[PDB]
């Protein structure tokens, strides 16, 4: 459910969500990483667990609609930059 930009997770949200102590989230994310569903890293001074993903999941109609909207935004950005590049580099293009 993270917005894919602030992928870092704080300790308190994990403790309040899984209703577990703040000393157990560390071992829990360690176990999840060890199994092969997470490829992040663990910090302690700030205790923010860095997050990267290699374990996908099942989608849904609303999720598919939202994610195809995101893909449409991505393709629009790609097209805009391609147009800018061809316009600016018209003479050099050949």
């Amino acid at each position: 459910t993270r917005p894919a930009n602030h992928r870092q997770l704080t300790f308190e949200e994990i403790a309040k969500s899984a209703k577990i102590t703040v000393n157990e989230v560390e071992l829990l994310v360690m176990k999840a990483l060890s199994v092969g569903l997470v490829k992040g890293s663990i910090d302690e001074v700030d205790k923010r667990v860095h997050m990267t993903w290699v374990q996908p999941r099942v989608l849904d109609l609303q999720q598919i609609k939202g994610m195809k909207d995101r893909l449409e935004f991505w393709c629009t950005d790609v097209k805009s930059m391609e147009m800018l590049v061809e316009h600016q580099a018209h003479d050099i293009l050949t």
């Binding site: 290699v54 996908p56 609609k65 195809k68 893909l71 449409e72 790609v78």
Partner: protein, 130 residues
Amino acid sequence: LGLPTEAYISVEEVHDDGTPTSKTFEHVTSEIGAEEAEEVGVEHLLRDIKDTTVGTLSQRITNQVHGLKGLNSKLLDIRSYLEKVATGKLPINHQIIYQLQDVFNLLPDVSLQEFVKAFYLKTNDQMVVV
């Protein structure tokens, strides 16, 4: 754009995750290689539009533009497929679709402070040489 050949192999399995079975044509990647005699034959056959293999700035820039065009085309095709799936005109695969989700997760997330500093450092390192 390219790749006028698509290689397909018949596979037969229970589809693992409990779905009705069918023939299906699993895709296998393809590429265009050449034998030395065929290589000299084709190079002499063109002899009028073959670009310089050294590249130079104009052809590198056109290669970059071609890459942007190809990426836009691929994203457009993927978006059309996703629209077909969402509208119900195509059934949700429920699998491989999450490999496209893996595409979505693999975004580098630029504007990160460390990445920005490293990017500026290398840009200046190239700019001084330029």
